[PDB]
Amino acid sequence: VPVPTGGDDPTKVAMLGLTFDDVLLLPAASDVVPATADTSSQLTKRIRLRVPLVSSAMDTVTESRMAIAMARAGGMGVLHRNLPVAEQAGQVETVKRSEAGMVTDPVTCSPDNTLAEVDAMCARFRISGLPVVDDTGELVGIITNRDMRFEVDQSKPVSEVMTKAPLITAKEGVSAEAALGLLRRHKIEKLPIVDGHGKLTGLITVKDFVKTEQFPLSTKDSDGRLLVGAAVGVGDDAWTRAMTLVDAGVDVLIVDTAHAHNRGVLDMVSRLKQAVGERVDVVGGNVATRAAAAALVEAGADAVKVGVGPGSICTTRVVAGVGAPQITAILEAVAACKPYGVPVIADGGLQYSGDIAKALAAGASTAMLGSLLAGTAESPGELIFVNGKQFKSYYFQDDVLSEDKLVPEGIEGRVPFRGPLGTVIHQLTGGLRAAMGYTGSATIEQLQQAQFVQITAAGLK
Amino acid sequence: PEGIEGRVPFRGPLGTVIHQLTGGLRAAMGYTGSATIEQLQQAQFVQITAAGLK
Amino acid sequence: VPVPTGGDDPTKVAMLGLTFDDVLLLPAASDVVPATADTSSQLTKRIRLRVPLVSSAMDTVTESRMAIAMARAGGMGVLHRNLPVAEQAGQVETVKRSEAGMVTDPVTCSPDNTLAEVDAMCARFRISGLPVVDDTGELVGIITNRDMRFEVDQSKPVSEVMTKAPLITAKEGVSAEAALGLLRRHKIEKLPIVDGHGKLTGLITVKDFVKTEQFPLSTKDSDGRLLVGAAVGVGDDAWTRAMTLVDAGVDVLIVDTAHAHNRGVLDMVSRLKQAVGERVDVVGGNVATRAAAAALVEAGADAVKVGVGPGSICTTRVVAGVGAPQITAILEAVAACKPYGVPVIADGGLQYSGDIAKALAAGASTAMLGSLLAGTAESPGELIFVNGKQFKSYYFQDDVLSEDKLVPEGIEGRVPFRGPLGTVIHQLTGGLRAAMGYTGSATIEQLQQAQFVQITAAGLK
Amino acid sequence: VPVPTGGDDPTKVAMLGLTFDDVLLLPAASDVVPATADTSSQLTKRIRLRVPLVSSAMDTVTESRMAIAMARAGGMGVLHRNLPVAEQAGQVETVKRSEAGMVTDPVTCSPDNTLAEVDAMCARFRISGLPVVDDTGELVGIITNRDMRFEVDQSKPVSEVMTKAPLITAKEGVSAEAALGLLRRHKIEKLPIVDGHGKLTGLITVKDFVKTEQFPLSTKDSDGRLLVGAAVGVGDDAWTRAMTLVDAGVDVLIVDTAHAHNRGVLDMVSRLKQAVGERVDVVGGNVATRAAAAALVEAGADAVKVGVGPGSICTTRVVAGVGAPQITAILEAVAACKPYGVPVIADGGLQYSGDIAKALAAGASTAMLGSLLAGTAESPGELIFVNGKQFKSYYFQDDVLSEDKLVPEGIEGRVPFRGPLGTVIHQLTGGLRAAMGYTGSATIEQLQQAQFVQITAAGLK
Ligand SMILES: Nc1nc2c(ncn2[C@@H]2O[C@H](COP(=O)(O)OP(=O)(O)OP(=O)(O)O)[C@@H](O)[C@H]2O)c(=O)[nH]1
Ligand SMILES: Nc1nc2c(ncn2[C@@H]2O[C@H](COP(=O)(O)OP(=O)(O)OP(=O)(O)O)[C@@H](O)[C@H]2O)c(=O)[nH]1
Ligand SMILES: Nc1nc2c(ncn2[C@@H]2O[C@H](COP(=O)(O)OP(=O)(O)OP(=O)(O)O)[C@@H](O)[C@H]2O)c(=O)[nH]1
Ligand SMILES: Nc1ncnc2c1ncn2[C@@H]1O[C@H](COP(=O)(O)OP(=O)(O)OP(=O)(O)O)[C@@H](O)[C@H]1O
Ligand SMILES: Nc1ncnc2c1ncn2[C@@H]1O[C@H](COP(=O)(O)OP(=O)(O)OP(=O)(O)O)[C@@H](O)[C@H]1O
Ligand SMILES: Nc1ncnc2c1ncn2[C@@H]1O[C@H](COP(=O)(O)OP(=O)(O)OP(=O)(O)O)[C@@H](O)[C@H]1O
Ligand SMILES: [Mg+2]
Ligand SMILES: [Mg+2]
Ligand SMILES: [Mg+2]
Ligand SMILES: [Mg+2]
Ligand SMILES: [Mg+2]
Ligand SMILES: [Mg+2]
């Protein structure tokens, strides 16, 4: 009748929880070469990444710069929501406008504006070339960086400096090969695209072709723009934030909570899925059990994020006594999500590339990276020297169960510097490809079927 | 054994200590869905290994 | 012919400078008991302190609270100038209004004010009871804290709560004994003072008598208000600041510069001396040589402050290569100041109470305390607990040679907590009295005649 | 005109003070073997020690046990005064009654005393045998430990247990050889000494002869009793204490103050010298200058104790800024005391046996040992074990300038254990004999003529 660990209830201690340090991947029969392993995996039901890594929605990790770098490297970034709605939507617009096959609404000016006004617009949009349109809206010329750098009078009007028409233009529906051929034939960097009446419709640049050459792994939509995601909370303010982010062109909305097994979180996920589910993917917040993941799947989540107090010395574990070891949490959530084709994102507790391999082997489809990217060059903050060491120096946060609530008030800052993001991503992908080679996994979907060996405490000495 | 014990370190006012402890308890109640202490007495544990203490 | 340290110029290495660690006070014939030694000393030519200690004009040391505490303990506080002119003059007013023989400009309300507005006035001025005057100027009542505390409705007019006239009042020129006898006979705390016409002219409180009995060492003017000093820089902004501070009732102005051997500083000292010299005393900034002290005396300074890079690992020493050991600097400055009766304030480099005694024995009249007071309860800042330890948390600074120009941009704060100011002052004064007993110095002027023994490096191991 | 270290006064810095670490003894022409070096020296004008060492009058160093052990080793002990007058006089009596050539007031019982009363008297006086006298005063027998150890009945009277007369006795003034021969012939440990009437006058024991053989270097008066010293302060309580101690049989009185250059201390020395000078020697308290030593010599002191803040990190140096390096202080005091034949006792700053040699070579006649003896088994306290280590666990103090007035309240205790006193004394005397061998000094008076070499800071690395 009694339980060996105490009491008369055998379900009081429901499980033994394994963390990353408890397991190792077993070698298996392999013809897979590490350099030829396919590391592509599903982020949501509709979005597939070339590198199964996403950066966290933390204010020390992902802003527009980190999102652009992650999308270029084959992953994706999730923009944090610790800021006003308009500023977050502006960061989304910055990421979506970084590059494209064709600029659909290019920034234009008028012949009357002074060169200082064009300078201000160039600074505001971080571009250097503008087509010029009059009151009638007809294309009259183009003013670029070459014209302006050779003019001292900043009060001159555009008409006196601009390259007047006829310009090298192209018609709507022009092929990329033909557009690039025109650009190289005339030795120009810009090519406006016009309709049948001669009105401006778009702009094609050489720099977009060069960027496509330089970053062949980029995560992009059908228009050639980088994909980005953004985090929202729960409540009416979160609804307005989500609608603004959807207008700005976000691709993924992550309902980001510390404890998603809540009726409010599930209702928010269902509401967003009904409202904008045709366009954007909705990802459910952090869960750690099978029942919570099943509830999120029932609510219509396109992916389930897993982890609740996954770190060993975690503040949730110390202050509230609440946690779930991450390997067991991933196994339990995958048991609920896999029959419906809903991907799992492992969020938290990753220290090494081996942990990424173990998390993918346990069943997750992607890993979300936090502290591993906090000190990179692309992360927010300014780079400063202190005692010969390099560091990175820097209303919302409405989650009642978030760790910032549990921690006492104080000061934190001066995260260390870690170098460029590309080297970190290269090292992590190298570890993952080595694991795929050892396990004989040609794809991530095959890696999700690999076996573990459980090790004892002596194996960690 | 016979000896000397003394000089306990100072810890501040009692109110902040009680506030911190009750805040942690309320966070646990929110995580487990326990509206009262009697419901908190029905919550489940997960046992962790030694690697969970490092 | 060549100098043994190199070169041919024997004045290239001008002197050997002694710091505090190099010297000790020699015991001499003594009949002085440490408890009956007289530690009074001149701060300026006209101001004598019971305890020869002054707090530094640093934004982590002296604000109104520290100034009040220092003046009550027998010293004085100098308010820092790292703040707007209005805020500094307001802190001057806060110190001057802490206590007096008779409040000569009492705060009054009108019979039509409401209890919320009277409560707001009490909040603004940190008082609790107001006399009431009508548009005629006649005293018709008084409303104090007992009247307000029992009234739940804060919208009631004063005329419905106030104690109506006739009140317990007294004529101008009443002796203190008579006023206290009236206050005790009628068992009240406040006594309005009116002229022959019954128009309100002042107020006398029991709290002032209690404060006078409680702090018998207080530094006070002829009106019984606490003395205070403030720091000013150089320039036109400094002139406006100095005039404002004089209007607010400051008693000492300190032209506080890192390098006072400069025409600008000398001209500022002369200007203040000619403008406001009959009311306030003017103290010249930091010098380290005989010639600079002589220049300040010729300019007309009432006291001379001494110390330029006086600490061993000072930032001025490391970054600029400039400094002066403090014992030698004090000796050189006193050689210029003593024949004219100008007191010397030793600023910087003090670590222990023995150093205070040594500074006074070298010829200084007062010591200025910085870091030794930064962590006390009366210094600016809020008290917090960080990891089991107690810490104190927290356009101007236009001095071209100040240390903040030399230290790189960075972060500072969280000074350690050090307890109440009274215990620190007690310990320092006890050390000074012990030194006076050892050297046979009944007064500070006799301590200024004591002899030193120079010790070697082995005596510092 | 200017002094190179500052100011115009060349006497402001009077001297350069040498400590022990600043000097070494230079080897000189020698024919002295360390084993045959004579280490005897004068403590006062009338007392010569075989080992020139005295233990400090500290409550952690010298009580009756330490004083007895020191006097047996050839030095002397000074009983501390941090205790009631009766208890210090009792400790003086304990030391003086430890051994003698002949016991002059032997403890006696009466035939009607029970065995329990005799046991109580034995424990009180720490003896084991008693002569028995009647009301007539005739010696009626003797009861020793042998008689009592075989008695089960504690309630019996002495007359039934004692060895009845006739006893083996001797006449007054019997020689040492005759008394010891009579003791050995009858195989007894005790020999009463009687007068012409046969009334008891004294007692001779074999244990005293054995002690004289066992400790041949003992410091003794003419009666064969060990010498002891005791400290007094200043005041009328101190005068009463001094008179009580002189009655108890003290040999040296030390007016023990932190600063003896005081009229109170000098007048106390003169008073004691005039009242009890012919019986006991008076030693003057701590000085550090030639003038103070000259004043003590004029007051009539028989020895002068030297040292005021001699330790490098002494509390007097840190808190009051007062001190004097010990080598220079000894040289200065000897310059005043030697022409008058007054010995100098060096007190404080001694860490090694080499320091003892340096202090004697500087001119001192004896060294006072403080912290070097606090851990020894003979020092007061109880030996205990804590964490595998051995430690020694433990109204007055009117000296206004003492270190305990300077140090804040807190916890001091648990001095570490250091072993038996004899080993420490042996090590120190071996060092001193090696120094005498190197310098060619046959006596301490020749060692006082040895030369020093001053070393630089590089010699201490
Ligand atoms: N000119 C322009 N570029 C835009 C606009 N919106 C986004 N972009 C992107 O900005 C990049 C072009 O920036 P520009 O500064 O104009 O570059 P460029 O002068 O053509 O090229 P470089 O001389 O190689 O820098 C391309 O990747 C465009 O897709 C827009 O309105 N105008
Ligand atoms: N009432 C009053 N006190 C003033 C004013 N300005 C300065 N003070 C000082 O503030 C103190 C009186 O403050 P209150 O709290 O009003 O005095 P109280 O009610 O008599 O004092 P308690 O003993 O605290 O009840 C005295 O030291 C006054 O000298 C003023 O305008 N009104
Ligand atoms: N018997 C005795 N000894 C005294 C007295 N006062 C001091 N002493 C000293 O104490 C020692 C003798 O102590 P006892 O215990 O009687 O010695 P004992 O029994 O002869 O000696 P052992 O048996 O060898 O220990 C000698 O050193 C005496 O000088 C006294 O009143 N009586
Ligand atoms: N489509 C076009 N038709 C005609 N002239 C053009 C066109 N695009 C650019 N120009 C003109 O050609 C010149 C070079 O412009 P281009 O866009 O090639 O580079 P740029 O941004 O001006 O130069 P850079 O990036 O080297 O500073 C400018 O004088 C510009 O006005
Ligand atoms: N001079 C005065 N003449 C008449 N009434 C007075 C006078 N001073 C005070 N009172 C009245 O006496 C009462 C007690 O006020 P008092 O100033 O003595 O203390 P309080 O500051 O109001 O209260 P407490 O200090 O005890 O909290 C009040 O009702 C007040 O209006
Ligand atoms: N002078 C004496 N004449 C005669 N008998 C004596 C004399 N002194 C001691 N005795 C006795 O001789 C016996 C031996 O005593 P002794 O003094 O030799 O040693 P003790 O101190 O009694 O014993 P222990 O052997 O423990 O030291 C005792 O019975 C004692 O009473
Ligand atoms: Mg360009
Ligand atoms: Mg270019
Ligand atoms: Mg009141
Ligand atoms: Mg009151
Ligand atoms: Mg015996
Ligand atoms: Mg025996």
UniProtKB/TrEMBL annotation, chains A, C, D:
InterPro entries, per database record: Aldolase_TIM (IPR013785), CBS_dom (IPR000644), CBS_dom_sf (IPR046342), IMP_DH (IPR005990), IMP_DH/GMP_Rdtase_CS (IPR015875), IMP_DH_GMPRt (IPR001093)
Pfam families, sorted: CBS, IMPDH
Binding-site residues for NAD(+), renumbered to this chain: D256, T257, A258, G307, V308, G309
Binding site for GTP: R97, V107, S128, G129, K190, K207, D208, K211
Enzyme class: oxidoreductase
Domain CBS residue range list: 102-158, 162-219
Catalytic activity: IMP + NAD(+) + H2O = XMP + NADH + H(+)
Pathway it works in: Purine metabolism; XMP biosynthesis via de novo pathway; XMP from IMP: step 1/1
Example GO molecular function: nucleotide binding
Active site, renumbered: C314 (thioimidate intermediate)
Gene Ontology BP terms: GMP biosynthetic process; GTP biosynthetic process
Residues annotated as binding IMP: S56, S312, D347, G348, G349, G370, S371, Y394, Y395, E409
Record key words, sorted: ATP-binding, CBS domain, GMP biosynthesis, GTP-binding, Metal-binding, NAD, Nucleotide-binding, Oxidoreductase, Potassium, Purine biosynthesis, Repeat
Binding-site residues for K(+), renumbered to this chain: G309, G311, C314
Cofactor(s) essential for the protein: K(+)
Activity regulation details: Mycophenolic acid (MPA) is a non-competitive inhibitor that prevents formation of the closed enzyme conformation by binding to the same site as the amobile flap. In contrast, mizoribine monophosphate (MZP) is a competitive inhibitor that induces the closed conformation. MPA is a potent inhibitor of mammalian IMPDHs but a poor inhibitor of the bacterial enzymes. MZP is a more potent inhibitor of bacterial IMPDH.
Binding site for ATP 2: T144, N145, R146, D147, T163, I168, E189, K190
UniProt subunit comment: Homotetramer.
HAMAP family: IMPDH
Entry similarity comment: Belongs to the IMPDH/GMPR family.
Name of the protein in question: Inosine-5'-monophosphate dehydrogenase
Species this chain originates from: Mycolicibacterium smegmatis (strain ATCC 700084 / mc(2)155)
Gene symbol of the encoding locus: guaB
